[PDB]
Design a protein around this motif. Structure first.
Motif, PDB file in Angstrom:
ATOM      1  N   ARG A   1     -21.663 103.813-111.841  1.00  0.00           N
ATOM      2  CA  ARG A   1     -21.307 105.228-111.807  1.00  0.00           C
ATOM      3  C   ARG A   1     -22.496 106.135-111.530  1.00  0.00           C
ATOM      4  NH1 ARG A   1     -20.510 109.755-111.254  1.00  0.00           N
ATOM      5  NH2 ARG A   1     -18.854 111.101-112.065  1.00  0.00           N
TER       6      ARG A   1
ATOM      7  N   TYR B   1     -20.656  99.226-116.167  1.00  0.00           N
ATOM      8  CA  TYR B   1     -19.970 100.359-115.543  1.00  0.00           C
ATOM      9  C   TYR B   1     -20.840 101.609-115.524  1.00  0.00           C
ATOM     10  CZ  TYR B   1     -16.135 103.157-113.792  1.00  0.00           C
ATOM     11  OH  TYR B   1     -15.348 103.963-113.017  1.00  0.00           O
TER      12      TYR B   1
ATOM     13  N   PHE C   1     -30.311  87.514-116.150  1.00  0.00           N
ATOM     14  CA  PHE C   1     -28.862  87.480-116.364  1.00  0.00           C
ATOM     15  C   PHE C   1     -28.145  86.340-115.651  1.00  0.00           C
ATOM     16  CE2 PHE C   1     -29.637  91.827-117.806  1.00  0.00           C
ATOM     17  CZ  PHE C   1     -28.791  91.905-118.884  1.00  0.00           C
ATOM     18  N   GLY C   2     -28.619  85.886-114.511  1.00  0.00           N
ATOM     19  CA  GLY C   2     -27.803  84.837-113.937  1.00  0.00           C
ATOM     20  C   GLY C   2     -27.984  83.434-114.486  1.00  0.00           C
TER      21      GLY C   2
ATOM     22  N   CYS D   1     -15.190 108.824-109.497  1.00  0.00           N
ATOM     23  CA  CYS D   1     -15.081 107.628-110.320  1.00  0.00           C
ATOM     24  C   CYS D   1     -14.433 106.503-109.524  1.00  0.00           C
ATOM     25  CB  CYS D   1     -14.264 107.916-111.562  1.00  0.00           C
ATOM     26  SG  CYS D   1     -15.169 108.731-112.897  1.00  0.00           S
TER      27      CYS D   1
ATOM     28  N   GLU E   1     -22.005  87.244-113.892  1.00  0.00           N
ATOM     29  CA  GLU E   1     -22.640  87.808-115.070  1.00  0.00           C
ATOM     30  C   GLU E   1     -23.560  88.945-114.644  1.00  0.00           C
ATOM     31  OE1 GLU E   1     -24.970  85.076-117.328  1.00  0.00           O
ATOM     32  OE2 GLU E   1     -24.343  85.878-119.273  1.00  0.00           O
ATOM     33  N   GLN E   2     -24.093  88.823-113.430  1.00  0.00           N
ATOM     34  CA  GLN E   2     -24.992  89.820-112.862  1.00  0.00           C
ATOM     35  C   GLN E   2     -24.310  91.164-112.638  1.00  0.00           C
ATOM     36  OE1 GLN E   2     -27.022  88.459-109.348  1.00  0.00           O
ATOM     37  NE2 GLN E   2     -28.308  86.995-110.463  1.00  0.00           N
TER      38      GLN E   2
END
Ligand SMILES: CCCCCCCCCCCCCCCCCC(=O)OC[C@H](COP(=O)([O-])OCC(O)COP(=O)([O-])OC[C@@H](COC(=O)CCCCCCCCCCCCCCCCC)OC(=O)CCCCCCCCCCCCCCCCC)OC(=O)CCCCCCCCCCCCCCCCC
Ligand SMILES: CCCCCCCC/C=C\CCCCCCCC(=O)OC[C@H](COP(=O)(O)OCCN)OC(=O)CCCCCCC/C=C\CCCCCCCC
Lengths: 71, 68
Positions: free
Chosen positions: B60, B56, A3-4, B41, B51-52
């Motif tokens: 959680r 969500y 992903f990076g 939450c 981007e890493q």
């Protein structure tokens, strides 16, 4: 290829929301039914005509085989 | 002095702030952490280049050990 290290990207934003704070079927039969409509409509003008032909040849062929033996 | 008034009344002396701290134990901390942290939450904010930063659904799932 993790992903990076994939691309470079600028000035854009996103606005998510939790799963435990909302509902899974907002509108089940008021959106899905008009949805299937525009879909199928837009597309069953170039999927049906090919399959009419196989029906016309099918009925012309069993008719001939039957009347060549039973007069 | 002038902020205590708009928030409590009765500016709190230093002798009182210390006899509250004489009460805390190891067990008192464990309750008050569970009541506020376990299985709740969160809200999240981020500023580039990210981007890493995980999705969500995976932030959680780190709020509860699957053993206790
Ligand atoms: C890659 C393979 C993943 C396996 C390594 C997981 C790490 C093991 C670990 O230390 O966590 C303990 C493990 C994970 O749960 P946790 O409490 O969140 O632990 C935090 C981890 O350190 C941190 O959790 P995490 O980051 O590893 O979570 C990612 C998650 C994501 O990975 C997946 O599970 C993907 C699952 C779909 C594909 C799986 C294909 C596997 C082939 O993988 C899991 O941890 C799920 C493990 C559950 C299976 C083990 C159940 C044992 C029976 O705890 C338990 O599963 C307890 C359940 C069984 C306890 C039995 C005790 C009585 C006997
Ligand atoms: C029979 C006798 C009694 C048996 C007990 C019951 C048997 C029925 C099984 C019931 C399934 C129970 C589902 C629970 C499984 C589970 O706990 O997985 C945990 C795990 C935790 O991940 P998170 O969601 O991120 O949460 C983290 C929380 N800290 O969640 C999942 O794994 C769900 C994803 C489904 C994975 C699918 C696994 C199947 C793949 C098997 C491959 C095929 C193997 C067969 C080939 C043979 C190999 C030798």
């Amino acid at each position: 290829r993790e992903f990076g290290h994939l691309t470079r990207m600028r000035h854009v934003i996103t606005y998510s929301l939790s799963p435990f704070e909302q509902r899974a079927f907002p509108h089940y039969f008021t959106k899905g039914i008009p949805n299937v409509l525009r879909r199928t409509r837009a597309c069953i003008l170039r999927v049906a005509p090919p399959f009419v032909v196989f029906y016309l040849v099918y009925t012309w062929g069993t008719q001939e085989f039957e009347k060549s033996k039973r007069k | 002095i002038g902020r205590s008034l708009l928030t409590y009344g009765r500016r709190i002396p230093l002798a009182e702030w210390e006899s509250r701290i004489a009460e805390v134990d190891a067990s008192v901390v464990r309750e008050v952490c569970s009541k506020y942290f376990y299985d709740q939450c969160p809200a999240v904010a981020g500023l580039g280049p990210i981007e890493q930063l995980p999705d969500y659904n995976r932030i959680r799932s780190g709020m509860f050990w699957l053993r206790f």
